[PDB]
Design a protein around this ligand. Structure first.
Ligand SMILES: [Cl-]
Ligand SMILES: [Cl-]
Ligand SMILES: [Cl-]
Ligand SMILES: [Cu+2]
Ligand SMILES: [Cu+2]
Ligand SMILES: [Cu+2]
Ligand SMILES: [Cu+2]
Ligand SMILES: [Cu+2]
Ligand SMILES: [Cu+2]
Lengths: 336, 336, 335
C-alpha cells in the first residue's frame, strides 16, 4: 500500500531488446515484489513494409513495430519512463491493458514533442497484455501506424498447466501482428507523403472500409523469413507470444500445434490443449507453448491464408535435429 | 411437466425498462418455478443514429434498439405477449435462442399488423441469449434494422465462479451492439426514405459487401456517453451483458478488466478470468463481471478501434470514489 | 513401438463416403493401434455453386467440396495414397493439421499430374482437424477453390464430457463451409473461364478484398436444404463436425443448441456447454453434440445472417417425432 513501503522496495533497471527477442528475465521470481524500470523513446519514422518499396509513417515505441515486450512478475510495480523527442510532430501517450485506472495510464501520460513522463502501476493480474498509444480523438490512427506492443506479467511461481504441473520454456519469441491501411492513387499504386499529418485524411478513408492492405509480423512482409527466421531444436520448449492491438488473428504453426495455448492470454484461465489454430481477438495478446518434435522449416501464419500469403502474415522457424519416422514418413515418394 | 402442473404455477407480471437498465429481479430465485409474463409492442420508426442526421428505419421491440433485457430463472416458463399494432407495415415474429423448437418460437409467432400472439417456453438452459425477429425470406433485413435484444436466464442459486464461490452484482447494465448498413448516393451522402419498404433493395446491396456504415451501442453514436454515461462507484460489483445478433464484437473496458467473463454467455461453462478483451461471436450474448477499483471516466469499446472510434461503438462509465495510488501513480507529470 | 512392432500392425482399408455422410467406424476403438489406409483421387472440375448458374473451377479431394471426413483413433497411423491424374493441369499436395512434421505432410506430397504418393503419419492428438492443399506460392488459391476437408481422431475410449461421462452419438454429419471469390465483369456478371489458370489473376484480386462472393455448405447454395436436408428423430444424439480452412464461422442450430461444443475441435480440451452460437476460427474444425428434443425443420446457419441468407451458408435438419408442449407452446396463435 504505502508510498513509503514502495520507496523501500528493490529497483531493477532493464535494457529492452527489439522483437522478436525478449530481454533476459527469470520465469520463477527470485525474492519479493520489485519496482522494475523501463525507458522508451517514441520515434515517428518512415518504414518500408514490402519489396515494392511501399512506405508508412510509423509511430514506434522504441523505434520498432511492434514495440518491445516488457517482462515483470505478478505484484511487481512497472515504472516507465516515456520520452517524446522534440523532433516528433505529434502528441502520444500509453495505455497498458495490464494496468488499472486512468484509461490504462493514457490520461496520465499525454506528452507533446519535447516532453517526458514517468508512470508506475502494480501488475496485479498475470498474463500477456497489449499496450498501445491512445490520444483523444486520434486513437485508431496511432494504433494502426504501429504504435503498439505487449507486456508479459508472469505468475511469481512461473507458468503452470491447468492441473498444477510446471511448464518451463527454453526460449520465448514475441510476434507482433500489424494491420496497415496504405492509400492508393488513381492507378492503384501506393501513395507517399512527406509528414505523417498529410497521410491522415487519406488513411481514415481506407480504415473505414475495415480492409487492411498489408498484415505483417514485425513491421514488414517477410521480416521473419529467410535468414531472419526464428530458430529452435528438436526437444526444445518454445513460448510464442502474439499480439494484435486492433484486429482479430488466428495463429497456426504449419507442421506443428500449440501444446498449451492461453488463447485469451491470461495465466489464471487454464490453457486449451492440442490446438491446431487458436484465436486472438483484436485488442488482446495470446501465448502458445510447443515442444518441437521434427526438424525442418515451419511456417507460422495467420490462418486466414489470404492474409498470411497475399497480405504478408507469415513467419518461418528453422528447426535442427533428427527426423522421426514414427511420427511421419514418406512411404512412396511422388512417382509417375 | 404436465399442462395441469403448469396451470398450477404462480404467475408473475414484469414491467420492462429501456436499455441499458434492466427490470427489477432477484438474483437468487425466490421459491419454485413460475410463469413469468412480459408484453412487448413492436414499433417501426425512423431513428437518427449519428450527429449528421443519418436515418435508419428501425424495427424495434418495445420501441428501443436493442429491445429490453428480460430476466427469468432456470426452469421458469417465459410467457410472451407480442403485439404488432395496425400502425406498422410489416409482418414480424420472434426467435428466442434461449428456447427449444419451432425455430426458437419463430414458426409460432408470425404476426401481421393488427395481430397479437402469446408464446410460452421453458427456460431450460442458464445464460444470456440473443432474441431476434426472423421472418422467412427477410431474416437479416429485420435483424440489421435493430430488431433484436437479449434475455438472461439466471441459475436458481444465482451466479457462481468456476469453483462455487457466489458472485453477487450491485449493478447490471445491458449493452446491445448494432451493425447498420445505410445506403449512399453517387455523391457520398446517406439516403433518406419515406417508408421502410422503400430502403429494402438499396440496403441489401450494402449488406452483401459485409461492411457496416455504423456500429453503435444502444441505437446511436454517443448514446451511452457524456451525460448518458453508465455509473458505478469504487467497490461496486457490476455485471455488463453485451449482445450482437449479427456480427462479431470484442468488448474491452479501457482502464479495467473482465474479472470473470462468460465469453460464450452460458453459466454452466466456467468463466474466463482477468480478461483484457473478450470475444462474442455474432448471434450470441456474453457477460462480464468486474469490481471497480479506481474512480474517473472509463470507455467501454469494441476493440477493433476503427469500429469503436470511427464507426460508433464506444460507451462511457463515470465512476466515483477515491484514487488508489498503490494501483497507479503519475511519478513525473508530463513536462519539458 | 519397435520397428518390428510398427511393421506388424494390422492394416485396414476404408472406403470413403461423400459429405455430409461419414464412413463406418466405431466410437470405442476395437483392438490395439492399426494402420488405416485411405485412397483419394484429386479432381479439377467445373461445379455450379448457386441457382444463377455461377461456375467455379473446383480443386476437389475425391471429387467433392469439402473433401471427405476420415476417421481413425488416437495413436492409429493414417496412411494416405494420394493420386493426381494425368488429366489435371496443376501440382497438388496435402497438409494435415493433425500431423507433425514437413508442413503437415505438404513438403512430402507434392505430386504433378500423372503422379501418386503415399504418406503415413501417427495421429497423436485427439480432435477434429482441417486438411487442405498447400502448394508453395499458391496456398490460398487451392484452399479457396475448395481443396480442403477434415479428419476426426477419436479418443481410444470414445467421446466424453468434462465430468468423464461417456457421450455416444447416434448420427454424425460433416458440414464443410467454403468461402468462394468469383470475379465479375463491369456489368456485374460473374465471369467464366476456360481453364483453372485463366481465372488466377482475377480471383486473387477478389481475394484481396477479403469479401467472399459466396459462403456455402457442401459446395453449393442450398446443397443441404429441401430433399437433401439432414435427418434425425426426437431423442437421437447427433454430432455435427464443421470445418472452415480459411475464414471464421459462427455456427448456430435455429430451434436447438450445442449441448457440448468442442469449439477449438480438440477432445482433450473440455467442451463448452449449452451453447447458442459457437465460433470456429478459419483454419480449424469444431464439433457440436446435441440431443433433439422437438420435431420439425431446423436451420443450421453461420450466424452472420447476411452470410447465411444472402451468401448461401444455411442448411436444414428434418426431425421426426412428437411435439413437447412443456418445452414450448403457442398459448394464443396469431390473431
Ligand atoms: Cl496452413
Ligand atoms: Cl483501448
Ligand atoms: Cl438465427
Ligand atoms: Cu501515438
Ligand atoms: Cu486498448
Ligand atoms: Cu421484424
Ligand atoms: Cu439467431
Ligand atoms: Cu491443390
Ligand atoms: Cu493450414
Amino acid at each position: 500500500a504505502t508510498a513509503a513501503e514502495i520507496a523501500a522496495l528493490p529497483r531493477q533497471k532493464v535494457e529492452l531488446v527489439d522483437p522478436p527477442f525478449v530481454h533476459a528475465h527469470s520465469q520463477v521470481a527470485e525474492g519479493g515484489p520489485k519496482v522494475v524500470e523501463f525507458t522508451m523513446v517514441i520515434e515517428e519514422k518512415k518504414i518500408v513494409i514490402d519489396d515494392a518499396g511501399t512506405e508508412v509513417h510509423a509511430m514506434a515505441f522504441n523505434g520498432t513495430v511492434p514495440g518491445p515486450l516488457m517482462v515483470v512478475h505478478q505484484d511487481d510495480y512497472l515504472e516507465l519512463t516515456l520520452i517524446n523527442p522534440e523532433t516528433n510532430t505529434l502528441m502520444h501517450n500509453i495505455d497498458f491493458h495490464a494496468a488499472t485506472g486512468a484509461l490504462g495510464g493514457g490520461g496520465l501520460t499525454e506528452i507533446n514533442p519535447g516532453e517526458k513522463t514517468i508512470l508506475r502501476f502494480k501488475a496485479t493480474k498475470p498474463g500477456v497484455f497489449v499496450y498501445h498509444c491512445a490520444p483523444p480523438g486520434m486513437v485508431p490512427w496511432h494504433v494502426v501506424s504501429g504504435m503498439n506492443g505487449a507486456i508479459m506479467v508472469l505468475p511469481r511461481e512461473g507458468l503452470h498447466d491447468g492441473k498444477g504441473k510446471a511448464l518451463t520454456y527454453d526460449k520465448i519469441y514475441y510476434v507482433g501482428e500489424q494491420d496497415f491501411y496504405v492509400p492508393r492513387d488513381e492507378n492503384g499504386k501506393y501513395k507517399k507523403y512527406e509528414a505523417p499529418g498529410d497521410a491522415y485524411e487519406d488513411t481514415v478513408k481506407v480504415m473505414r472500409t475495415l480492409t487492411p492492405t498489408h498484415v505483417v509480423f514485425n513491421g514488414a512482409v517477410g521480416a521473419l523469413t529467410g535468414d531472419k527466421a526464428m530458430t529452435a531444436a528438436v526437444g526444445e520448449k518454445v513460448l510464442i507470444v502474439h499480439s494484435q492491438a486492433n484486429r482479430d488473428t488466428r495463429p497456426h504453426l504449419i507442421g506443428g500445434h500449440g501444446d498449451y495455448v492461453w488463447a485469451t492470454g491470461k495465466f489464471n484461465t487454464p490453457p486449451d490443449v492440442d490446438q491446431e489454430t487458436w484465436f486472438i481477438p483484436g485488442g488482446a495478446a495470446g501465448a502458445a507453448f510447443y515442444t518441437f518434435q521434427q526438424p525442418g522449416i515451419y511456417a507460422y501464419v495467420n490462418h486466414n491464408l489470404i492474409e498470411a500469403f497475399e497480405l504478408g502474415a507469415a513467419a518461418h522457424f528453422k528447426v535442427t535435429g533428427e527426423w522421426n519416422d514414427d511420427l511421419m514418413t514418406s512411404v512412396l515418394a511422388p512417382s509417375g
